[PDB]
């Protein structure tokens, strides 16, 4: 996958950026930034997501290089995803963090993200609403006033997403 080497923000570039409209960053040596990657590759009833390891590698290296301790969970049902997100939201490290990233990579449909057991007959779906709910101020008070970045690689349905025109 990708090396994830990030062009650095110079001392003078950070000065040019710094006024009262920027999220505060915590001290480098004391902060405990956390990121979570949930990636489903192997499914009961959906073809293997070949190339997912490339995505995992690249996102992991990038997030680490941006200063996040990265946890990776693979091949989960919507239920396991829910449990994992609840555990993540309660991690005490968030209290001494300034931000978080949550990365989801799976098959997907209009309703949401597919768990490993998903079928048309018996849905196994994580709703996007539940992600927000689980990371909200009530359920994740430690990330109050801190940027929560949610990245989702998935279809939102099976349409090519295009319209045709002659002229």
């Amino acid at each position: 996958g990708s090396e994830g080497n990030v062009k650095l923000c110079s001392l003078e570039e950070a000065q040019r950026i710094w006024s009262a409209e920027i999220y505060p960053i915590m001290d480098k040596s004391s902060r405990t930034r956390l990121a979570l990657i949930i990636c489903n590759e192997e499914f009961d009833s959906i073809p293997r997501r070949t190339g997912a390891e490339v995505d995992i590698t690249g996102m992991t290296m990038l997030l680490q290089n941006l200063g996040y301790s990265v946890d990776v969970k693979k091949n989960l049902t919507a239920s396991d995803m829910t449990t994992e997100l609840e555990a993540f939201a309660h991690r005490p490290e968030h209290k001494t963090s300034d931000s978080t990233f949550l990365v989801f990579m799976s098959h997907g449909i209009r309703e949401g993200i597919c768990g490993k057991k998903h079928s048309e007959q018996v849905p196994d779906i994580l709703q996007l609403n539940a992600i927000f709910n689980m990371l909200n101020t009530k359920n994740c008070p430690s990330l109050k006033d801190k940027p929560k970045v949610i990245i989702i690689q998935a279809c939102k349905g099976d349409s090519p997403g295009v319209v045709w025109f002659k002229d």
């Binding site: 070949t50 940027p147 990245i151 690689q153 939102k156």
Partner: protein, 87 residues
Amino acid sequence: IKKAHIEKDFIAFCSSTPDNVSWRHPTMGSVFIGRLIEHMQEYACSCDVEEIFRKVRFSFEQPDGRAQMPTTDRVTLTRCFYLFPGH
């Protein structure tokens, strides 16, 4: 007791628009993911995440071949999120 906003300081970035497919090369990986990494590597130094995400959306503008349009949703960031890489 004191009140706090239930939902604030979120941003979601999805690989495609509602109803629509996102593409993944079986050896090269997911196109959105690769594109996101590349833009983060390059622009995290000088741009806030909203700016970076817009740049990613721009890279998909031409609907050549396996078209898709990444979308930013449920944005309640009240401030600029700069990653300040190296800091």
